[PDB]
Amino acid sequence: LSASEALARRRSVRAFTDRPVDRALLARIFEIAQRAPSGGNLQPWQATVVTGERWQAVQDAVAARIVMGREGFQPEYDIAPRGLTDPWDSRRFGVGEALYAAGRIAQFQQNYRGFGAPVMLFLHCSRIMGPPQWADMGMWLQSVMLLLVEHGLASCPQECWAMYGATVRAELGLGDDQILFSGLAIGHADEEAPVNRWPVPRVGLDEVIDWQGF
Amino acid sequence: LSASEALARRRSVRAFTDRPVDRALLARIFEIAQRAPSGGNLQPWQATVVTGERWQAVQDAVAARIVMGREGFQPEYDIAPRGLTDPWDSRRFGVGEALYASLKAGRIAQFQQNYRGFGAPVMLFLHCSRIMGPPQWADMGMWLQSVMLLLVEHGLASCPQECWAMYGATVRAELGLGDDQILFSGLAIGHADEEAPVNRWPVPRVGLDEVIDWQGF
Numbered sequence: 001l002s003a004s005e006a007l008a009r010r011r012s013v014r015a016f017t018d019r020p021v022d023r024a025l026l027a028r029i030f031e032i033a034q035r036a037p038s039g040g041n042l043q044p045w046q047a048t049v050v051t052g053e054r055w056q057a058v059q060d061a062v063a064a065r066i067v068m069g070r071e072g073f074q075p076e077y078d079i080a081p082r083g084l085t086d087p088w089d090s091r092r093f094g095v096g097e098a099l100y101a102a103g104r105i106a107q108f109q110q111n112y113r114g115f116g117a118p119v120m121l122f123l124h125c126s127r128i129m130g131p132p133q134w135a136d137m138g139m140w141l142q143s144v145m146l147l148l149v150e151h152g153l154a155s156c157p158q159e160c161w162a163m164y165g166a167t168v169r170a171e172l173g174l175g176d177d178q179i180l181f182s183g184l185a186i187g188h189a190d191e192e193a194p195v196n197r198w199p200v201p202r203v204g205l206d207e208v209i210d211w212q213g214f
Numbered sequence: 215l216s217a218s219e220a221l222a223r224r225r226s227v228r229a230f231t232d233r234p235v236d237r238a239l240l241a242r243i244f245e246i247a248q249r250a251p252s253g254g255n256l257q258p259w260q261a262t263v264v265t266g267e268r269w270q271a272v273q274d275a276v277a278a279r280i281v282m283g284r285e286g287f288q289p290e291y292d293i294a295p296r297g298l299t300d301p302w303d304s305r306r307f308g309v310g311e312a313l314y315a316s317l318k319a320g321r322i323a324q325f326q327q328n329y330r331g332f333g334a335p336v337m338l339f340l341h342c343s344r345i346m347g348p349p350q351w352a353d354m355g356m357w358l359q360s361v362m363l364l365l366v367e368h369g370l371a372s373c374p375q376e377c378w379a380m381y382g383a384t385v386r387a388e389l390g391l392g393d394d395q396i397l398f399s400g401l402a403i404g405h406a407d408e409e410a411p412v413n414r415w416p417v418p419r420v421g422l423d424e425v426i427d428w429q430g431f
């Protein structure tokens with residue numbers, strides 16, 4: 001499977017089968033993903049991969065947070081930018097309706113069970129790391145996501161876990177020197193599920209690339 | 215070429231031939247790279263791709279700052295974390311070893327080549343709105359790595375370059391970008407000189423032991 005095809009076929013999967021994931025395969029995938037670049041070769045990404053009973057523990061700890069209402073929230077940072085304008089948000093609303101086309105509470109709690117993935121990756125780093133190092137983490141993460149598709153697996157990046165970073169970090173036994181960026185649900189896609197088959201929009205290049213001197 | 219092979223063969227190339235880059239191919243690489251994910255599908259990345267005379271103007275303007283010594287610096291942000299400790303600090307000097315081994319004064323001289331994109335014919339400047347936060351910066355990395363892998367797949371090479379953020383204001387000026395924008399990084403783009411010493415040394419990575427923790431398996 002070519003990089004183009006991997007890129008094309010990678011999507012945020014929100015329904016996984018219970019087909020087990022080969023730990024050997026994941027390990028091999030992480031080996032190659034480490035070839036992602038990073039400023040100064042800092043390789044600042046760190047990951048705690050959980051499954052089974054531990055993975056169920058994280059779910060329950062956060063579940064406890066969730067019933068606490070707005071008091072249970074423990075933001076690691078600002079997920080949505082303060083000062084998001086509505087022309088930016090129309091992008092999320094464009095994908096937001098299509099995902100669906102109150103009830104919302106129900107689907108969003110599925111986030112916190114990783115949409116049924118058997119494995120959950122938690123991507124974190126030292127609190128000393130700055131914005132370019134977070135960009136390095138993105139490079140690694142997208143490397144992982146593409147390798148998963150190539151290898152017959154699927155994934156869903158989830159920043160929703162950062163709503164409860166401290167709880168997650170505590171449950172993972174990570175120090176308060178670490179900060180949680182995102183979760184990544186991992187597993188085999190339910191490839192007959194509707195939520196996994198709608199076409200996902202992107203803006204046109206006219207909104208992205210400016211050419212000069214050509 | 216498979217995604218695994220792309221990941222494996224992608225390196226930070228610091229010696230390019232002067233074979234031009236096909237504008238058409240670059241355009242085709244960017245529509246596919248746009249399939250990168252992003253929080254909320256915000257797609258926060260923006261890029262200004264320069265070549266020829268424009269790419270020469272950016273070079274000259276930054277060179278003017280460069281001779282100003284350290285009084286000329288215009289950092290967009292903190293490139294290296296201030297107070298960077300081990301294990302991390304040993305990692306950059308170690309790759310620093312291998313990069314120069316395959317080549318004070320001369321050391322300095324080579325580093326300044328950064329500001330000519332190591333001779334690359336094309337330079338992409340990746341930027342975004344200043345409203346964007348750290349998670350949006352990770353979104354940009356996701357996009358950038360998509361581009362770098364697609365290049366490799368199509369026989370092109372690149373060098374991501376944060377060195378340009380040392381003179382962000384000047385670069386933004388020469389590109390005509392507003393101060394609502396912040397420059398993250400450059401990406402030098404071109405055809406790799408596949409006999410260059412600088413391009414053939416094996417690039418180290420830490421073992422998974424330092425990266426991955428497994429729980430419940």
Ligand SMILES: Cc1cc2nc3c(=O)[nH]c(=O)nc-3n(C[C@H](O)[C@H](O)[C@H](O)COP(=O)(O)O)c2cc1C
Pocket residue numbers: 010011012013014095111156157158159160161182200249250251252253254255349352353356
């Ligand atoms: C850093 C990051 C965090 C994300 N967090 C979530 C999340 O918490 N819940 C969710 O449903 N999707 C999440 N996503 C998926 C995005 O909504 C998705 O990538 C975007 O809508 C584009 O859709 P696609 O990836 O299927 O192509 C996240 C994506 C990224 C890159």
Ligand SMILES: Cc1cc2nc3c(=O)[nH]c(=O)nc-3n(C[C@H](O)[C@H](O)[C@H](O)COP(=O)(O)O)c2cc1C
Pocket residue numbers: 035036037038039040041132135136224225226227309328373374375376377378399417
């Ligand atoms: C965001 C970013 C900025 C970078 N900036 C520079 C740079 O300014 N100069 C340079 O020589 N290399 C730069 N690099 C390349 C890294 O040094 C390189 O990725 C690392 O040593 C690993 O080497 P490799 O990518 O060839 O495997 C940058 C990489 C990243 C991700």
